[PDB]
Design a protein around this nucleic acid. Sequence first.
RNA 1: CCUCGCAAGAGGUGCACAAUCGACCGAUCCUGAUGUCUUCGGAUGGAUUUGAGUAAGAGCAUAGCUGUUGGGACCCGAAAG
RNA 2: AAGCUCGUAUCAGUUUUAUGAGGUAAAGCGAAUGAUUAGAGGUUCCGGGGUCGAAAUGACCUUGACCUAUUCUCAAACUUUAAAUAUGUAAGAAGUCCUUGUUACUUAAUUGAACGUGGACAUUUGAAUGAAGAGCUUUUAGUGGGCCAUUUUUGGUAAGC
RNA 3: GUGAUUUCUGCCCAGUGCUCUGAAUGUCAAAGUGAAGAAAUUCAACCAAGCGCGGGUAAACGGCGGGAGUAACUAUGACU
RNA 4: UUGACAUUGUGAAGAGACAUAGAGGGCUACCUUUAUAGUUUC
RNA 5: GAAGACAUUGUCAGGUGGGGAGUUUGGCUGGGGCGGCACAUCUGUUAAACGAUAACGCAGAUGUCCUAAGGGGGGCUCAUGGAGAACAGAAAUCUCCAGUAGAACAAAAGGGUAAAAGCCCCCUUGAUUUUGAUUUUCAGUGUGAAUACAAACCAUGAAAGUGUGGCCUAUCGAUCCUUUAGUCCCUCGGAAUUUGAGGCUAGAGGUGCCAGAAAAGUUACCACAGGGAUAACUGGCUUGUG
RNA 6: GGUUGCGGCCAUAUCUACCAGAAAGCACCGUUUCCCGUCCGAUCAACUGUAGUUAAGCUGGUAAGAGCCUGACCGAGUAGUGUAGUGGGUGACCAUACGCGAAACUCAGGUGCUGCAAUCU
RNA 7: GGAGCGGUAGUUCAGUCGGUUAGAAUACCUGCCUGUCACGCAGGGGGUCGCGGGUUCGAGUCCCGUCCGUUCCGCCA
Lengths: 154, 58, 105
Amino acid sequence: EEHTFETADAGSSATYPMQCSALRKNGFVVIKSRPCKIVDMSTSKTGKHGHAKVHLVAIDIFTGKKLEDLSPSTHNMEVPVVKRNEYQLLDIDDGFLSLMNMDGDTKDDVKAPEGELGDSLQTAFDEGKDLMVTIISAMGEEAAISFKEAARTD
Amino acid sequence: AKSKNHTAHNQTRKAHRNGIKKPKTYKYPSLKGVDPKFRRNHKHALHGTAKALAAAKK
Amino acid sequence: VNVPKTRKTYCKGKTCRKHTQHKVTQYKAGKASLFAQGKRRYDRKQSGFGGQTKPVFHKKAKTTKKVVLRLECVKCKTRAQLTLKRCKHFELGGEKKQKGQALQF
RNA sequence: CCUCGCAAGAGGUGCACAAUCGACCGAUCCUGAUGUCUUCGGAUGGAUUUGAGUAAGAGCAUAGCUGUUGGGACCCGAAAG
RNA sequence: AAGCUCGUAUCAGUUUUAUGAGGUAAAGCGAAUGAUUAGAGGUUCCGGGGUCGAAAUGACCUUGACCUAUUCUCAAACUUUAAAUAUGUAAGAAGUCCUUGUUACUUAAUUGAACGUGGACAUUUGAAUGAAGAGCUUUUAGUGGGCCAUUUUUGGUAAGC
RNA sequence: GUGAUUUCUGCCCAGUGCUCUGAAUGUCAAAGUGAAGAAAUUCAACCAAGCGCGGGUAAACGGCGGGAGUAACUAUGACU
RNA sequence: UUGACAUUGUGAAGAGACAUAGAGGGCUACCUUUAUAGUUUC
RNA sequence: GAAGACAUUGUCAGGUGGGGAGUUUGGCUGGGGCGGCACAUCUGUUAAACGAUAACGCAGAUGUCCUAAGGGGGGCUCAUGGAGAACAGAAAUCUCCAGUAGAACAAAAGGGUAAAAGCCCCCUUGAUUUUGAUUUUCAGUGUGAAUACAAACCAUGAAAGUGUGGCCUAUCGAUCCUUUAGUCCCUCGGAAUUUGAGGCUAGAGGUGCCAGAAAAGUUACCACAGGGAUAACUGGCUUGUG
RNA sequence: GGUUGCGGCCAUAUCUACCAGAAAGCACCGUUUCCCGUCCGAUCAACUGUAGUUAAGCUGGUAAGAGCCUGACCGAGUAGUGUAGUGGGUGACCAUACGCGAAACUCAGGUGCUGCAAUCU
RNA sequence: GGAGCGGUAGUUCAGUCGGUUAGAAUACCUGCCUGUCACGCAGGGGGUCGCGGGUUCGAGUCCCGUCCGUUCCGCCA
C-alpha cells in the first residue's frame, strides 16, 4: 500500500558547555574543534585589576598530540560527552577489530587501535581468555582505549 | 553600594487616599464564564419569551 | 526515550475526520537551498566591504531539541506534525519493555 | 415632561449614559440546497472564535494653554573624530 | 487641572450578632518525628563474656542491645492541643412571598433551572454611626538615592551597622 | 641577539613558530567540464596554493619533576 | 602569494585521465591489462 | 643583445596578513579585584498564625527520565517485627500471626494516598483536533505551567464515570530569517500556462547575563566628565581582638 | 425492641480480654458437569438448602480497663498578647490602667446515634 | 581566612569524574638450578581500597561530615 519506510535516525543531543573555571584534571574539553583530556591546568591574574584567565594544556584522547589553550574564565569551552561501551573482543579480522556487545554482537568496525597499548592486546590475543575491551564514542570518534580481561566465566 | 531593595513602607496608606475602589456590581452581570450549553439554551428563552410579552399585547 | 512506529490518532483529511492508523516518520531539517528572500536579501548585504553584518551566533547552551514526529495517515495520507518534550536519546524502535525480568549481569 | 393627586406620592412617556442580551457586515471554521462552457457557483442557515465594526450618522478649519518627537533646542562644559 | 452624570445616592482604613479560615507566642513529648539523662524488671537459644558441668536451645552472675513502667530538659526547617492582635462574608427591594408563562438545556414527567408575567408586602423596608456631596472620565506634570522612633524580628560579640 | 679579553656556551623539537628540489589523491574557491531539467538552476564529477600529514632546526621563542626504600651508633643516604 | 581569463601570435613531439570491446582477476566494488573509436589537461 | 608569447600589465577568485584600521572588554556585588551567583526557575525555614515581604540569610535541587513509571478496569496490599521448614547460615525462598502504615510512588523537599494515588494482571494509546475562558508572576502585559468547559472523535469500563501527559508543587524560553505541514487556498499588478518566489494558519531550528546586543586584554605615561551614593590618612560610635 | 438490604454523623461507635444470644434472620457449611477463573474451586463462578452447627464472625453484656468525646469559677485568670504612660528597673525585663484568654496536670461523667424498606416469638 | 584537590596489599601507582569483577610493577614466599648467596627459571600469597553517616537493590567505583596531607590566593593604597 505504501513503502520504502524512510528509516533515518534519532534526533536531538549535543555536547554540553560549562563554565571554564570548573574544569579539572582528566576533564574533557574541545579545543581545535577536537576532543581532549586535561593534564596541565593553570590560572593567573592579568595585571592589577585582573579578570583571571586560564591556560590549560590537554593531551588528546584520540590523536594523542599535546594541545594548549588560553581563555578568560567565565566564557564557555564546550565540553564533549564520553561513554564506555565495554565491548567484548572476539577475533580481530583484517584491519578492523571485531567487538561483541552483550546484547548484540554486531559492529566489527573500530579500525583496531593505533595504540601502542593495543599491541600488547595484539600480542596477547592468541593466548586468549575473554577479551573485554572498552571503547569511547565521544563525538562519534571511536577507538580502543583499554584492555581488560575477566578471570573466569564458565 | 547596596540599595534598599524591597519594602512596603508607606503603601497601605497611599491606597487609602482614593479609598479602595469598589468593584461596582450591576444588574444583569456579564455571563462571561458561564458554560456554553446553559448559555446556548438561554439564548432561545429571552428571544422567544419576549414575543408572548410583545406579540400577545396589541 | 522511545516511541511507537505505529499510532492511532485523529486525522482531518476532509474525507475522514476520524481516527486512523499512522506511520510515524521523524522530522528532518532540510537543505536551506537558495533564492529564499532571506538569502538574496542577505548576500546583497554581504557583498562590498564592511564584511559581516547580520549578527553571528555563539552562546549556544541548550543541548536538546524537541523531537518532532511527522505523522502520516494511511488513507488520505495527510501529514500532521506533533511535538514531544525535549529528550537526549530518541528512538522509534520497538521491543517494548518486559515485566522487570532480572537485570542482566 | 404629561395624567391624576391640595400635597405627599402613583402611573405613563423616557433622550443622554451605564450594564447586559440579541440582530446585520467582514475574517476563520461547518453547511454546502437549487442550478451548473461539469464543475463552478454559491442560497440557506450554524460556530466556548474574531474586528481599531452598524445599530437616523459629526466633522473640518483657525487661534490658544498644556504635553510629546524631531531639529544648535534651557545656558555653558568636554578626553577625542 | 479640566469637567461631566447625578444630587441621598450608595457607601464608610469603624463596631456589634452570627459564621468562617488561619499554627505563631505558649504548651507537650508517661502522644507520634527528633534528640537526651539515671536508675529498676524481664530477655535472648538469635550477643561476647564469667564461675561450676565431657557437654549443652546449661544453674546463676556479665555488659551491649532491647522490651516494660518511671524520671531529667528540650526543637527556626517537631506536633496532638491553641490565644489577643490583624483578616472574609452577611445584615434585602437589583428582597421576600404567592401565582403563572417562555426554551433546540434538563427530567420518571413544562419535573427543573434561568429568567419574566400578575398581585401582597413602602418606609422600622427590616443591626449600631457618620457622610463641606456619590459615581465617572480625560490629561499631565513631579517622584522612582530615603531616614528615625515604640512594638515584632534576621545576620552580627556590638554598633548613630 | 649578545655584549671587551680568559674559560665555557649543557639537556629537551612534543608546544609555538620558521622551513623541506617533502609524500600527496584527507581538506580544497572562482573558472572549466558532464548529467538532470522546457530554463534559470540543482547536482556532482575533477579541483590552486596553503591547511592537513610527515622532515629538520634551540647563540628561534621557549622549557629543565616528583615519592619512596637502604650503610653492624645516630644521622644522612652514593645506591635500588 | 596562488588559480582562470584577456594582450597572445605561428608551430610542433611524446604521456596520462576519462568511451567502448576482448582477455587477467576476485555476476564486479574493482583490478593488471589490452585492441578499438573520442573528449583532454599536459 | 638578450628574453619569448612565457613574464609583466588589467579584471576576478582562494590563501596569507596586528604590519594597518574600526570596535568592544558583562551585572549583582555590606569599596572593586579574584571568589560565588542569590541575574531564570523550584521545596522548607527566616514571615512577626489571611495575603504580601527582604538580604553573597540557612538547608537543597533542575535544565533531565518515562509509549511508559501514561489511561482505564480488575485482583491483591506494604516496611517491619514474631513463629517455624533439608542443604541455609544476619542477607537464597516459603507458610502463618501481629502490622494506619513506621513503606512505594523517575529524579530534591513537603504534602497526599490502601479494597487506592502503592504491587500485579487485561486493553490501550485523549502525551490527538478546533479554539477560546480562567487562576498563577502581574503592567493584572507577556513565556511557562495548571484548572474548568464546550465541539468532536476515541480508549477503557458490566456500567455510572474516568481520560486532552506523568497524584501535586520545578523541567522552559519573542520579532527578522530558515525550514515542515495544513489549507492545495491567495497573489506575480497588460493576458495567459507551468517550474520559482511571496503570503495565511500551526509548529520546529536559539537566544540559560534565562522579556532575548554578534565581541579579549593591559595602562606607575593615561585622558575628560563626575562621585564622598564608592575605599586609603584623620575623627565618631563599636568592642571581639589586644 | 431483634434481624437483614441501602445508608447519613463518623472512635460518646476503636482496641484488648472475657461472658452470653430464643425465634426467625444472617452467618459458617455441602458438589463441580454446564458459564467462569486461579499453581490450586480456599478466594471467584456455578448448583440445593439439602447433610449440620451457632464454635467462630455478627449483635449485646462484662472489665476500680487502655482509649476517645464532654464537662467541671480544678489547674488559671496563671502563662501570652492588643492598647497607654517623661511607670519602675543599670538592663534583662517587671508591675499597673483598660481588655481578651490558652494547653498539660486534676476530678466528675459518658461509651454509638440514626434514616428508609422488609421481616421477626 | 578563603577556596581548590589526595588519601588503594610491602611501596609506588591505575580503577578511580561514567556503581553491580580492585589490575600492574617491584617488594616478600615457595620449588629448581649453584658449593652456597647473587642472578635466571616454574609457580605463590597478600589490601573493605584513610574513617563516621546517608542515599543507592548494589559504592574505593555517589552525597555530607570529620581525619590527616597537598596547593593557590593573598593585590590598589
